[PDB]
Design a protein around this nucleic acid. Structure first.
Ligand SMILES: C[S@@+](CC[C@H](N)C(=O)[O-])C[C@H]1O[C@@H](n2cnc3c(N)ncnc32)[C@H](O)[C@@H]1O
Lengths: 87, 107, 76, 93, 377, 95, 86, 98, 107, 93
DNA sequence: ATCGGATGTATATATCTGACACGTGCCTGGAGACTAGGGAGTAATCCCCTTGGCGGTTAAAACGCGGGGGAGAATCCGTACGTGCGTTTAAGCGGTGCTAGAGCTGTCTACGACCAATTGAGCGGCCTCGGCACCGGGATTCTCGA
DNA sequence: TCGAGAATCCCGGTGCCGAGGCCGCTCAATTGGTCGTAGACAGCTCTAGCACCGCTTAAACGCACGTACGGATTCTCCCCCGCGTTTTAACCGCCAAGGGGATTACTCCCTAGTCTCCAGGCACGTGTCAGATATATACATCCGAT
């Protein structure tokens, strides 16, 4: 507890039931026990890419708030155009 | 003389004037033809009309009188051409269609 | 005599007239039944537009006939 | 500062196609973002076509070709029909 | 194998296609068709009806004159000749001719041609004229191959001139193959006495084919390109000569050449009486489609309009300036093009027939029709 | 006791016809912030931005799991395994 | 053979050894016999898309010759960015 | 008997030969005719600048080679070395082409 | 008034002037900064240096002193970051990297 | 007329990095197309950044951000370092 | 496992050839030097939306325990495709000619940019009520073990 | 086939907050002028894409053998589903503080524009040598016999 609460890994916060729900929405009847760690890593990679692009946009704008338009532009850069948050 | 919107001249609901101003301010080209914004506004109105017609059909089939993101998702994905147009697009609060593979159904 | 009218939105409207009823009266009944302004209404029978000054009997309307209504949304 | 959008126009089109059906705020934002996305797609493609021909003007021909390139199949045909009809109605005024 | 599909469709004649009176009043042929030899070991083919005319073909297995000769002889054995001569001719020359053609036997092919000429020259002409008077049906491929003979005589020597169209999306030349023409004419129910119009006739294949295989009282063709106009004149002259050679009657055929159907007095005055109108609008741009609509305003009831693209723009509606329009009274029916239906491609596609009705078509009022093609979870 | 796979199919039906976010909001928000702390500046993450990140991540993972299920069925299996995800991302071009 | 020499199917011209070589370049050891027709279909679809885009580009330019740069633009539209032709 | 390699050996030899080379594996004239045919759907008689057909062949061969790489990955994933139409369909479905 | 090219000032080999003219003429924005073309030319020079250095290494490995498209393909695909940058890029006459899956090799 | 390209500049960079290595015309065209493609990518991304900030000019900052967005990882770091070096040297003299 | 036979393929020397690299004219694009506008930096202020924390509550998550159903392994069939070999096809090279379609140059006329005055469309704020969300209860529809 | 048992659907009533409509009030679209110039049309050039022919021979095609692997069947077993109980921590509604994102205002440096100067680089031409190809053969690899 030095100056800012350095957050923990918080990738286990994507719990096993949440991954099961995401799979079930995808039409998955059975899930191997190793899927959870694999898709946790996949989600971490995807979030790292998108957040890196969004924070690049934010830092270029000389802002300190990752605005929803920044995330929309970051996703649009990667060919994952997101609707409903402006554009 | 009395003002008459170019959208009214073209029989379009969409804003021909705003489309022209966006084309000019968007640095798409040094010059922008007079008929270009009318054509683009008509195309945008058409695509909006198609998606809203399909979404309203979805809402009526779902016994709701108000279009929500789920109805837009159903309208977009249930149509082959619109889905292909919006293939790389994520619609917030859309979910996915009901699809269970025939292998997964019980024997 | 019962007649049917078809609109662009896929609806059929039933209407009761005699042959002597004038076209303006028909437009007024469409008004009081559906709420459409009369000036926006255009009535088509057999590919011929019905004139307000003429009567239904002028065009030789038959029983259980079909008509079409067109709404002037914006026009030109 | 005024935040422009296609909200009223999407609503007008909705009342043209489905008079008795509304549209929600989230759905309204999604439709506005869709209109913006397709607008920038078509405008960028028309800009690229203008550049390739070394032309400084975006005319209805450029937008028509852009619509042909982007929209798949029957969507392109119907959109081009609407564009041609609208431009024809506009030029006769 | 045979040159002609003997089991192919047999079109039923609905008018006196073979001019019997001309054949009885004339026995010496005076026309001068473009000879096959002049196109660019020779064999002379003997005309079945007229003794005085010989057609020379450059016979060499090193445009296929041999295939044309085989087709002509087979059609003669099938159509023009009565029994017992038809059976004798079938049994004698056709097997040897087919064997020679398959084996590329030049000497055998020429010997078969000579045997055919020798055997025909003893047949009575009166019997041939009697059979032609009695005929009521002929193979669907006979008119097609006859028109192709005329086409090869006229269009192939100057076919390249058809490629002078300067534009990409208008005035582009493309033909509809005779099989497709017979299919659509049968679908549209062309009959004797009807009027056929062709907007943009190209070289005039459609007009002449209608005039031949349907007996139209007037087959009309409008063309703007100078090259296509000159080719149309040449093709029509060759067709008249060949029809006189075979005795076939050719009905009234009219052409408006080197002038657009737009704002044309003749087209405008003929549209009201027209019974079928063929408009190959595959690449007609939007303004030309509007001009076609303006012309077709005066079309009558029952007049069927064939096209490769729908006359109505697919999002056509009725709000203000369409209550008086002809397009509201069109029943549009789409059908699928077969393989080898059009000249410019083999794949195919779609084509529409729009029938003019007394009343407004009820299809456009239903929103289901206007859609391109339930939506629920 | 329902047989194995019955409640799985019921859950598939329930979540395919519903649109709510399937990942808890606060754990995902903390994940996003943790991913962003590698830039030493303290960011603020406008709440609509975090919702947008959750929307995009859930849609991406749903499409990924659809592809994973297709791969698993291609191998004549119904159980998805990490090799299925690896194949899906390899074919998609993400690895 | 009317005014234009209409081409026959010519998708068999993408012959079985050619598809075999394409597969072998991809690291394919063994090939099912039904790969050839399905690959012909896939190639026809891809070429139809690219050529349709290229001919659209040519149509806009009021040209009748499909330049190589048109094909490069058509491939760039599909995300198939091609180098070596400008 | 004559010297005969067992199955799968000459296939690996071909893989090594064609992965280390760069020439076009589809013959020029058949692909040219295929391209011209695919363009005859348009009525206009197109000319196809000679570099354009070559670029089409480059792109199509690269696309098919990538497709067959993905197909081979799918086939190996199913515990098989034989690619099948199901494999290509899976590859094109995952890639987003179907 | 001696003329000294901006590429000479920046110490770059690439054409700062042509890059500025291309930025201006492309309608990328209403105006283009003075430091923008220098920076972009430097970036292009660096990436060209990377591609050509790896390609020259590939050519030297093949005992060849001319970079051909194959050498560019090997340089691009054997380096992970350049491959990811050029992931969707097809290099004409480039071929494919030599790779055979492990299961396909004989036991 | 003249058809411009980066052939001479690519060749200069080649003789800088590899003095005794030539390059073929096909490889030269590929390298020229690569430079054109990267220039288009960076310029388009910088245009998007200028628009998103309601900024009408493309400064070196916009190009730097576009490079950070486009080039992966270590490439972006080295490209940014080289660009900063070039801009500093240019502004010094 | 190890030894020869045949095969493919890499090494080697020689020997072409046409594409690369270098030299030169010049001309058109880059560079130097004002000028003036306006876009962007910097400073001040508002207050919107962020953080951080709180306590309470309740759904969701985690743990653990059957058990059965799907994964993986092993066996065996048979047929489908790899590998040669002889035959057939037609692609590839290599010359020639056509001519027409892309490219460049020269009017000039329509059309779009720019600017100023006007005002009605469209956006920000604020009711307000009705369509959608929640909750209780009854009917409908698998699911599964019998 | 059946019946208890569990989701799930539906019916009704209640509640609420956000979609829809209304009211100002900007300010961006419209109208109407000119005026620069983009490009549409026409003419000319010229070079490259189409088409043809003939010969060589490399690749394709068909057929036959056989073998190895795709597919089906059967077995084991272990791990992942489903359910019950407990725990944990998300979600809520809440309060407050304040970080910094909009916003406006002022100044002024940077870049568009233009005009002239000039030299860098693109077209053209020419030497010559890196690579392609053929030939000859040592060497590595596959495969069958022992
Ligand atoms: C697609 S071709 C059809 C030829 C022929 N009717 C057939 O189907 O076999 C259409 C022809 O119409 C002609 N054409 C196009 N526009 C025309 C116009 N506006 N007026 C007269 N002819 C026109 C062209 O010369 C072209 O040859």
């Amino acid at each position: 507890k030095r100056h800012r609460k350095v957050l923990r890994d918080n990738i286990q916060g994507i719990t096993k039931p949440a991954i099961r729900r995401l799979a079930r929405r995808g039409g998955v009847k059975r899930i191997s026990g190793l899927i959870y760690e694999e898709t946790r890593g996949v989600l971490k990679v995807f979030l790292e890419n998108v957040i890196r692009d969004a924070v690049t946009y934010t830092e270029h704008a000389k802002r300190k708030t990752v605005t929803a338009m920044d995330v929309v532009y970051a996703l649009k850069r990667q060919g994952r155009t997101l609707y409903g948050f402006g554009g | 003389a009395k003002a008459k919107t170019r959208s009214s001249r073209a029989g379009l609901q969409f804003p021909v004037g705003r489309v022209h101003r966006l084309l000019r301010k968007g640095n798409y080209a040094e010059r922008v033809g007079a008929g270009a914004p009318v054509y683009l506004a008509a195309v945008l109105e058409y695509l909006t009309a198609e998606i809203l017609e399909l979404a309203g059909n979805a809402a009526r089939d779902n016994k709701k009188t108000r279009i929500i993101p789920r109805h837009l998702q159903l309208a977009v994905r249930n149509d082959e051409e619109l889905n292909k147009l919006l293939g790389r697009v994520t619609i917030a609060q859309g979910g996915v269609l009901p699809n269970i593979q025939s292998v997964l159904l019980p024997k | 005599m019962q007649i049917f009218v078809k609109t662009l939105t896929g609806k059929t409207i039933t209407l009761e007239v005699e042959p002597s009823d004038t076209i303006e009266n028909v437009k007024a009944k469409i008004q009081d039944k559906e709420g459409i302004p009369p000036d926006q209404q255009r009535l088509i029978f057999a590919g011929k537009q019905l004139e307000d000054g003429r009567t239904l009997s002028d065009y030789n309307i038959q029983k259980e006939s079909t008509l079409h209504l067109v709404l002037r949304l914006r026009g030109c | 500062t005024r935040k422009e959008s296609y909200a009223i126009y999407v609503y007008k089109v909705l009342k043209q196609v489905h008079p008795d059906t509304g549209i929600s705020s989230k759905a309204m934002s999604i439709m506005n973002s869709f209109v913006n996305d397709v607008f920038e797609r078509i405008a960028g493609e028309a800009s690229r076509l203008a550049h390739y021909n070394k032309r400084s003007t975006i005319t209805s021909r450029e937008i028509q070709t852009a619509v042909r390139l982007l929209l798949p199949g029957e969507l392109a045909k119907h959109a081009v029909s609407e564009g041609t009809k609208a431009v024809t109605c506009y030029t006769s005024a | 194998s045979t040159f002609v599909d003997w089991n192919g469709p047999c079109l039923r004649l609905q008018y006196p296609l073979f001019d019997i009176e001309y054949l009885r009043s004339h026995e010496i042929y005076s026309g001068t068709p473009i000879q096959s030899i002049s196109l660019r070991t020779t064999a002379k083919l003997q005309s079945i009806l007229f003794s005085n005319y010989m057609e020379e073909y450059k016979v060499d297995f090193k445009y296929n004159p041999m295939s044309e000769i085989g087709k002509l002889i087979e059609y003669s054995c099938l159509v023009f000749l009565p029994s017992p001569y038809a059976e004798q001719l079938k049994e004698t020359i056709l097997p040897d001719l087919n064997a020679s053609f398959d084996n590329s036997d030049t000497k055998g092919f020429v010997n078969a041609i000579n045997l055919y000429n020798k055997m025909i020259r003893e047949i009575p002409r009166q019997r041939i004229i009697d059979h032609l008077e009695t005929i009521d049906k002929i193979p669907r491929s006979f008119i097609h191959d006859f028109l192709h003979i005329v086409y090869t005589r006229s269009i192939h020597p100057q076919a390249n001139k058809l490629k002078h169209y300067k534009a990409f999306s208008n005035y582009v030349y493309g033909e509809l193959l005779p099989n497709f023409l017979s299919d659509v004419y049968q679908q549209c129910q062309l009959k004797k006495g009807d009027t056929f119009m062709d907007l943009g006739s190209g070289v005039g294949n459609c007009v002449v084919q209608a005039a031949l295989e349907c007996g139209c009282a007037l087959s009309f063709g409008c063309e703007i390109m100078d090259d296509a106009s000159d080719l149309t004149i040449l093709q029509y002259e060759e067709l008249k000569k060949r029809c006189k050679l075979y005795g076939m009657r050719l009905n009234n055929v009219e052409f408006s050449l080197k002038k657009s159907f737009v704002d044309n007095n003749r087209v405008a005055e003929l549209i009201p009486q027209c019974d079928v109108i063929l408009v190959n609008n595959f690449l007609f741009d939007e303004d030309l489609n509007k001009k076609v609509e303006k012309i077709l305003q005066t079309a009558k009831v029952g007049c069927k309009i064939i096209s490769l693209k729908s006359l109505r723009s697919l999002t056509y509606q009725i709000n203000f300036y369409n209550v008086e329009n002809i397009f509201n009274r069109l029943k549009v029916q789409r059908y699928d093009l077969k393989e080898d239906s059009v000249s410019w491609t083999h794949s195919g596609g779609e084509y529409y027939i729009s029938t003019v009705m007394e009343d407004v078509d009820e299809s456009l009022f239903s929103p289901a029709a206007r859609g391109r093609r339930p939506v629920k979870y | 006791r329902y047989r194995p796979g019955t409640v799985a199919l019921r859950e598939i039906r329930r979540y395919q016809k519903s649109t709510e976010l399937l990942i808890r909001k606060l754990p995902f928000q903390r994940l996003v912030r943790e991913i962003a702390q590698d830039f030493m500046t303290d960011l603020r993450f406008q709440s609509s931005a975090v919702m947008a990140l959750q929307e995009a991540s859930e849609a991406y993972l749903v499409a990924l799991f659809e592809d994973t299920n297709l791969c698993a069925i291609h191998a004549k299996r119904v159980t998805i395994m990490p090799k299925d995800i690896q194949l899906a991302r390899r074919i998609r071009g993400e690895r």
